[PDB]
């Protein structure tokens, strides 16, 4: 009864979260996950500012209203060599990573570790935050509010 959450640096408060090392988050779970980090799904404008501060990934994830990949450098295997906030247009499937936005983060790049899931609720799951440098923080709790996600 364990969930690993891989988290990135924040860029203008925006970060990427991947659950259990694979595309595995529904739209509803993504909102609940961001809420657990006292965050929200980013708007497109928030994501564009994050991009301008250095944010890029090679993974699809939810924002408010779309699934996107922020890209700074063109790479053939990431968003088909596009740059900018690449919007996923056509897909059969519903599960991705998520982006989240924390307004209380620093204004530019913050590559410090994340060491709390401050708004998790009581529950039986061992939830582990994993930072890119390997630092880990674990707590027992839950964050999913929709049964179809459990």
Ligand X SMILES: COC(=O)CCN1CCc2ccccc2C1
Burial 60-71 (b: 16+ CB within 10 A, else e): bbbbbebbbbbb
Q: Of 88 and 145, which CB lies nearer to ligand X in the complex structure? A: 88
Scan for tokens 């990427």, then name that residue: 16
143 known ligand binder:
no
* Closest distance of CB 80 from ligand X, Å: 15
Burial 2-40 (b: 16+ CB within 10 A, else e): ebebbbbbbbbbbbbbbbeeeeebbeebbbbbbbbbebb
Question: Among residue numbers 50 through 79, which ones bind ligand X (CB under 6 A)?
Answer: 57-59
Number of residues that bind ligand X (CB under 6 A): 11
Judged by CB under 6 A, does residue 8 bind ligand X?
Answer: yes
Judged by CB under 6 A, does residue 144 bind ligand X?
Answer: no
60 known ligand binder:
yes
Instruction: Could you list the residues known to form a binding site for hyaluronan, using ranges.
Output: 22, 59-60, 86
């Amino acid at each position: 009864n364990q969930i690993d959450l891989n988290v990135t640096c924040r860029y203008a408060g925006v970060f990427h979260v991947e659950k259990n090392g694979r595309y595995s988050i529904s739209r509803t779970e993504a909102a609940d996950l961001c809420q657990a980090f006292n965050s929200t799904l980013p708007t497109m404008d928030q994501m564009k500012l994050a991009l301008s501060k250095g944010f890029e990934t090679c993974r699809y994830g939810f924002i408010e209203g779309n699934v996107v990949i922020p890209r700074i450098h063109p790479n053939a295997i990431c968003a088909a060599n596009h740059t900018g906030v690449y919007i996923l247009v056509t897909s059969n499937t519903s599960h991705y990573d998520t982006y989240c936005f924390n307004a209380s983060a620093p204004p530019e790049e913050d590559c410090t570790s994340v060491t709390d899931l401050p708004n998790s609720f009581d529950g039986p799951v061992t939830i582990t935050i994993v930072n890119r440098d390997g630092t880990r923080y674990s707590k027992k709790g839950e964050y999913r509010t929709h049964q179809e996600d459990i």
